[PDB]
Every structure is written in C-alpha cells, then in structure tokens.
Amino acid sequence: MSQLERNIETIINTFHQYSVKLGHPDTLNQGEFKELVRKDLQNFLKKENKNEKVIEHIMEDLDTNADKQLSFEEFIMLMARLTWASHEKMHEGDEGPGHHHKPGLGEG
Amino acid sequence: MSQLERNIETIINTFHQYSVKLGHPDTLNQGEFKELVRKDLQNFLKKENKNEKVIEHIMEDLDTNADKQLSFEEFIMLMARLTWASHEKMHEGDEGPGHHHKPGLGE
Amino acid sequence: MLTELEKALNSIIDVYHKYSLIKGNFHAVYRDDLKKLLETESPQYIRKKGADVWFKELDINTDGAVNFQEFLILVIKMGVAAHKKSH
Amino acid sequence: MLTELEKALNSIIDVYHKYSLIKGNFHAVYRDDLKKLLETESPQYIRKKGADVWFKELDINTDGAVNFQEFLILVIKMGVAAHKKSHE
Ligand SMILES: [Ca+2]
Ligand SMILES: [Ca+2]
Ligand SMILES: [Ca+2]
Ligand SMILES: [Ca+2]
Ligand SMILES: [Ca+2]
Ligand code: NA
Ligand code: NA
Ligand code: NA
Ligand code: NI
Ligand code: NI
Ligand code: NI
C-alpha cells in the first residue's frame, strides 16, 4: 500500500490499541483517550499532557454526540488538527520566496 | 439580511474597496493586499504587519493559481483562517467545564 | 478597538454558537440545528439546496454533527456565492 | 524522537507536498496534481469516485486547486473509510 495508506493505518492501529481495552472495544473512554495522548502524543501535546483537565476538555470537545466515548469518526478530527498545527509550525513566520519546512510540532 | 449575510457583505465590500483601485477591478495585487491588511487587519495580523516580507508571503500562499493576483475565491481563505485562529484564541488552554470564549485575536 | 472587518469575522463565530450552544456538544451543530441555521442565516439560493444535502456535504467525518471548521466550509461557499451573485 | 503516530502525521504532510510542490503555488494541488495523488496514494474504493468528482468536492473556495486545509478533508474521509474497511 501507499505511504498515505500506511499513515492512516497507523492512526487506526493506534486507535485500536486502546479502544479495545475497556468497555466498548471500538470507542475510547476517558481513560483510554488519556493513555493514547500521554504516550503516542507526548510531543505534539507535550504542554497539554501537563494539565489533565485540558486533556479532558479536548475529549469533551471531540465527543460530538456527548456519550463520553470517542468513536474513530470523532477521534480523526484531532489527528487532522494536529497535522494542521504541525504544518503551521513549519511555516511559522515564513518569508519565502521558496518553500521550506522548519521543525514541526513538538520540535520534531 | 441576517447577521451572517451582514458579515459576508462586509467581507465582500472590504475586498472590492481595494480591488477596484489598480489594474483589474476584481482582484488584489500586492499593494492592494498590503493596504487591506495594514488597516482593516491591523489587530488580527498585528505581529505579521511588523514584517513586510511576511505580508507578501501570505499573499504568495493565498495566490492559488500563482498569477500575482488575489481573486475573492483566494482571498476568502484568509478570512476563514483568521476566523478559525480567532476562535482558537478564545479556547487557548481551555479546561472547562462548559463553554467560554476568552478575548480573541488582537486583544 | 477591532476594525469592522475583524468584527465581521468574530460575528461569524457568534452566528455559529447561536446554534451549536442549543444542545449537546458546545461545538456541534446537529441536523435539526443546521436547518434552523440555514433558514435564518442563509439566503434563498442557499436554502434551495436542502438542509439534509447541506448536512451530508458539511459533515466531513460523518459523526452526526457540524463542528466549527465544517461550518467554515458553509461560510466560504456562502461568501463565494454572495460575491458571484452580486454585481 | 517523535512517536510513530506523530511521525505518521508529519508523513501525511510530506505526502501532500509530493504533489503540491510540483508546480505553481507551494500549497496547491491542482486538478491534474490530484489525479496523480489519488492514483498513487489512495486505494481503489477511493479512486472509483473519480478524480474530477473528488476535486469538485475538495475545492471548497473554487479557486482551482486543493490547499492543505482542503486536503485534510480527503485524509479525514479516507481515514473514516479505511476504519470501516478494517471491520469488513
Ligand atoms: Ca473502549
Ligand atoms: Ca462519541
Ligand atoms: Ca490569483
Ligand atoms: Ca462532523
Ligand atoms: Ca481550493
Ligand atoms: Na485590482
Ligand atoms: Na450543539
Ligand atoms: Na502546487
Ligand atoms: Ni474500529
Ligand atoms: Ni508546506
Ligand atoms: Ni467556542
């Protein structure tokens, strides 16, 4: 498969690593979502991981149907935002004239 | 008109206030774009207005077809970005609970 | 003080929250809420597409709701349509 | 070092720039660029919709190309489709 497919599969694999642990095996509860962010997003959300209440409000904002569970449809919006924020970090104060990517989100 | 139509009309009138000045009366050049950002976006893009080369690269990124001009289709992506960045500024470090809006951009 | 253009952008944020703060998630406009948004905030040539059609087009991740970023899709398409319909 | 998920998000940025840096605006995938993007990066059940059908839906502001914002619409739809595909 292509590079983009392998990147999407990593998102699906990382989601399934935790969603299967407790409760409904295909959604993330508060405990499963915190563990994913603490380990697999320890750099992109390094500052947010220092305040547990911030992590809880991120899930509350993502939980659109308000069932205190994160389906993959609701979770992928977080992946799109972090991908958008990482690319914005690469062009922070870009003057051109060409295209160049500075270190992205989390100094990576 | 509704409130949303009122804001869209403000976006259209502000665009045509400068696009009709030089050259094609329906697009913005680098000079017409700089003036719009300098005064009508002096608060949202305050830090960006401090560097002239940064304002130019913003239009370069917005110029989708790369003809050194800015149609309204290309300019409206900047309005969506600043609207998004303003809403994100209201929820910066939001712990909850509930919903609250802090001061946005330029405040 | 913010300019009139900047106040217009923050007003768009408020227009969305007049319908996303009705019920449920604070940043989610459900199907019935979007029909209220279109019938109140959008012109006739935008309502003529249909609330269900607009919802399926705006609900990118298909989670049953329209967040703020998905609402900006409607604002962009309403702005281009209003510019193309004008003059 | 970034985790595998964080590297996957930056890799998505690299995938987009393999086609936006071809010509024109550095962050614009044109109709011909999206055709090469879909045929190379997306599976068959995504390509079967058609490159022109995808481009008209991705081109939100109808300016003639797909910026990184509109490209994330495809990544979201491809991710949701690939997730349902894993449970089939
Ligand atoms: Ca679970
Ligand atoms: Ca949910
Ligand atoms: Ca142009
Ligand atoms: Ca949605
Ligand atoms: Ca576009
Ligand atoms: Na002009
Ligand atoms: Na709501
Ligand atoms: Na390009
Ligand atoms: Ni699943
Ligand atoms: Ni880039
Ligand atoms: Ni809000």
Curated annotation (Swiss-Prot), chain B:
Q: What does this protein do?
A: S100A9 is a calcium- and zinc-binding protein which plays a prominent role in the regulation of inflammatory processes and immune response. It can induce neutrophil chemotaxis, adhesion, can increase the bactericidal activity of neutrophils by promoting phagocytosis via activation of SYK, PI3K/AKT, and ERK1/2 and can induce degranulation of neutrophils by a MAPK-dependent mechanism. Predominantly found as calprotectin (S100A8/A9) which has a wide plethora of intra- and extracellular functions.
Q: Which species?
A: Homo sapiens
Q: Name one Pfam family in it.
A: S_100
Q: What is the membrane topology noted in the UniProt record heading this document? A: Peripheral membrane protein
Q: Could you tell me what this protein is called?
A: Protein S100-A9
Q: Where is this region: Disordered?
A: 89-107
Q: Tell me how this protein assembles.
A: Homodimer. Preferentially exists as a heterodimer or heterotetramer with S100A8 known as calprotectin (S100A8/A9). S100A9 interacts with ATP2A2. S100A9 interacts with AGER, and with the heterodimeric complex formed by TLR4 and LY96 in the presence of calcium and/or zinc ions. S100A9 binds quinoline-3-carboxamides in the presence of calcium and/or zinc ions. S100A9 interacts with amyloid-beta protein 40. Calprotectin (S100A8/9) interacts with CEACAM3 and tubulin filaments in a calcium-dependent manner.
Give residue ranges for domain EF-hand: 8-43, 50-85
Quick one: effect of changing residue 74 to Q? Loss of resistance to bacterial invasion
Q: Which domain of life is it from?
A: Eukaryota
Q: Name one GO biological process term.
A: chronic inflammatory response
One GO MF term? RAGE receptor binding
Q: Where does Zn(2+) bind?
A: 16, 26, 87, 91
Kindly list the positions annotated as binding Ca(2+) 2: 63, 65, 67, 69, 74
Coiled-coil intervals in this record? none
What results from changing residue 77 to A? Answer: No effect on antifungal activity
User: Gene name, please?
Assistant: S100A9
Q: What is the effect of changing residue 79 to A?
A: Loss of antifungal activity
- Transmembrane regions listed in the UniProt entry: none
- Chief place where the protein resides: secreted
Subcellular location, record wording: Secreted; Cytoplasm; Cytoplasm, Cytoskeleton; Cell membrane
Cite the post-translational modification comment.
Phosphorylated. Phosphorylation inhibits activation of tubulin polymerization. Methylation at His-101 by METTL9 reduces zinc-binding without affecting heterodimerization with S100A8.
InterPro entries (UniProt xref): EF-hand-dom_pair, EF_Hand_1_Ca_BS, EF_hand_dom, S100/CaBP7/8-like_CS, S100_Ca-bd_sub
Taxonomy, top ranks, is: Eukaryota, Metazoa, Chordata, Craniata, Vertebrata
Q: In which tissues is it expressed?
A: Calprotectin (S100A8/9) is predominantly expressed in myeloid cells. Except for inflammatory conditions, the expression is restricted to a specific stage of myeloid differentiation since both proteins are expressed in circulating neutrophils and monocytes but are absent in normal tissue macrophages and lymphocytes. Under chronic inflammatory conditions, such as psoriasis and malignant disorders, also expressed in the epidermis.
The residue ranges flagged as biased composition, category Basic and acidic residues, are 89-98
Swiss-Prot record, chain D:
Per the record, the major location class is: secreted
Please give the record's induction comment. Answer: (Microbial infection) Expression is highly induced in CD14(+) monocytes, neutrophils, and developing neutrophils of patients infected by SARS-COV-2.
Q: Where in the cell is it found?
A: Secreted; Cytoplasm; Cytoplasm, Cytoskeleton; Cell membrane
| Claim: Cytoplasm is one of the keywords in the record | yes
Ranges for the EF-hand domain? 12-47, 46-81
List positions binding Ca(2+) 2.
59, 61, 63, 70
The S-nitrosocysteine modification is found at 42
Activation and inhibition: Calprotectin (S100A8/A9) activity on TLR4 signaling is inhibited by paquinimod.
**GO biological processes:** apoptotic process; astrocyte development; autocrine signaling; autophagy; chronic inflammatory response; defense response to bacterium; defense response to fungus; endothelial cell migration
Topology with regard to the membrane? Peripheral membrane protein
Cellular component GO terms held in the UniProt record: calprotectin complex; collagen-containing extracellular matrix; cytoplasm; cytoskeleton; cytosol; extracellular exosome; extracellular region; extracellular space
Q: Which GO terms describe its molecular function?
A: arachidonate binding; calcium ion binding; calcium-dependent protein binding; microtubule binding; RAGE receptor binding; Toll-like receptor 4 binding; zinc ion binding
List positions binding Ca(2+) 1: 33
Q: Where does Zn(2+) bind?
A: 17, 27, 83, 87
Other comments on record: Binds two calcium ions per molecule with an affinity similar to that of the S100 proteins.
Its biological purpose is as follows: S100A8 is a calcium- and zinc-binding protein which plays a prominent role in the regulation of inflammatory processes and immune response. It can induce neutrophil chemotaxis and adhesion. Predominantly found as calprotectin (S100A8/A9) which has a wide plethora of intra- and extracellular functions. The intracellular functions include: facilitating leukocyte arachidonic acid trafficking and metabolism, modulation of the tubulin-dependent cytoskeleton during migration of phagocytes and activation of the neutrophilic NADPH-oxidase.
- Mind telling me what this protein is named? Protein S100-A8
Q: Which organism is it from?
A: Homo sapiens
Read off the lineage from the record: Eukaryota, Metazoa, Chordata, Craniata, Vertebrata
